[PDB]
Amino acid sequence: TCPFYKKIPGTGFTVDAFQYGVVEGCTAYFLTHFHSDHYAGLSKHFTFPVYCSEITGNLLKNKLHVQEQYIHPLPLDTECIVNGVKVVLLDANHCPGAVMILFYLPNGTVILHTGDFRADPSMERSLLADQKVHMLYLDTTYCSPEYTFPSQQEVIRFAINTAFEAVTLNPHALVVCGTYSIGKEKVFLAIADVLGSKVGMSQEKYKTLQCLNIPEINSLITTDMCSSLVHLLPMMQINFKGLQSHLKKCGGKYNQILAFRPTGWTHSNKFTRIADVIPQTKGNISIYGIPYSEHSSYLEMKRFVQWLKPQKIIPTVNVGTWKSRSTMEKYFREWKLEAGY
Numbered sequence: 049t050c051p052f053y054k055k056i057p058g059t060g061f062t063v064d065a066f067q068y069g070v071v072e073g074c075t076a077y078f079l080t081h082f083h084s085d086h087y088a089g090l091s092k093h094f095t096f097p098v099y100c101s102e103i104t105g106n107l108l109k110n111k112l113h114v115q116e117q118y119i120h121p122l123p124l125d126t127e128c129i130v131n132g133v134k135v136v137l138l139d140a141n142h143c144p145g146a147v148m149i150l151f152y153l154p155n156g157t158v159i160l161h162t163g164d165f166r167a168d169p170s171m172e173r174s175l176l177a178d179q180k181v182h183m184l185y186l187d188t189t190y191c192s193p194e195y196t197f198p199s200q201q202e203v204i205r206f207a208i209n210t211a212f213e214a215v216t217l218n219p220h221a222l223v224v225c226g227t228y229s230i231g232k233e234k235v236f237l238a239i240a241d242v243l244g245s246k247v248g249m250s251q252e253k254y255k256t257l258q259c260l261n262i263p264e265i266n267s268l269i270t271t272d273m274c275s276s277l278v279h280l281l282p283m284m285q286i287n288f289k290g291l292q293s294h295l296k297k298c299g300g301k302y303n304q305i306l307a308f309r310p311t312g313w314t315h316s317n318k319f320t321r322i323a324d325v326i327p328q329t330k331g332n333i334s335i336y337g338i339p340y341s342e343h344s345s346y347l348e349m350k351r352f353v354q355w356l357k358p359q360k361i362i363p364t365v366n367v368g369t370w371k372s373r374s375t376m377e378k379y380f381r382e383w384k385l386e387a388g389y
């Protein structure tokens with residue numbers, strides 16, 4: 049049954065709650081972003097109102113075939129009225145089309161649901177600064193102090209320099225980048241840009257990217273693999289067997305693969321600096337794991353919450369074990385005591 053942390057009190061609303069069947073007394077289903085754990089259960093047969101960003105609405109219509117009459121896209125940073133309740137969508141700095149939702153309840157409570165986010169100081173100057181928030185439903189994916197990682201900018205710098213060096217030394221090398229959902233587009237796009245190539249990909253992936261309103265996308269992506277030296281593959285295929293196989297398919301156009309797997313976190317971060325990262329190599333294949341995250345680090349999350357000073361925090365991630373839940377609640381108390389709220 050629908051967990052409490054997907055329900056907005058004082059409304060008929062749910063958030064990312066599409067896998068429970070008909071939620072009893074839900075008059076509007078919000079979807080924060082197009083990732084499978086959050087959209088699971090949507091299809092062409094869904095007949096209730098879905099509220100989302102324009103980009104998420106493009107993906108609903110074109111990838112899952114949800115009918116147009118049930119998609120209610122809302123513009124960002126704009127006061128809107130839904131079943132008599134004022135709401136605002138804000139940029140979550142997650143994947144394309146991902147939002148946070150501000151709800152202004154009739155009784156005067158103000159709730160922020162972050163959906164999935166990577167906290168950023170830029171948020172401290174949006175519509176959030178203009179009023180107080182009583183309840184925060186928080187993306188706690190990496191809510192433990194061992195989760196440190198570099199800025200997205202330092203990681204893209206490392207990838208571009210690595211790729212440019214490799215292909216300049218060997219103009220017959222192929223670069224491969226893994227993907228399994230929308231998000232992290234900058235990795236493969238920035239590499240293609242420095243090399244003067246388009247990114248080659250499957251028809252289904254090309255379709256997904258064309259839903260995202262990315263400026264100048266017809267210039268950066270293609271389905272013609274033959275004309276490209278940056279290929280996008282499913283993440284699962286980013287291993288020595290999958291890559292040896294792919295290289296065979298290219299028919300002696302290329303004699304080396306440099307591949308990138310942008311993971312969330314990996315334990316090498318506690319010990320290693322981005323400058324200090326090395327690939328796994330076998331034969332003429334090298335694989336780099338790079339810590340490109342689209343979730344808050346522990347310190348980025350902590351800053352955001354200590355700025356916002358909510359009266360109550362409701363975690364939405366890692367809530368399934370008692371030891372996790374208990375540890376998170378202890379961090380929230382430290383933060384409140386340190387900041388004085």
Ligand code: NI
Pocket residue numbers: 081083142164
């Ligand atoms: Ni997500």
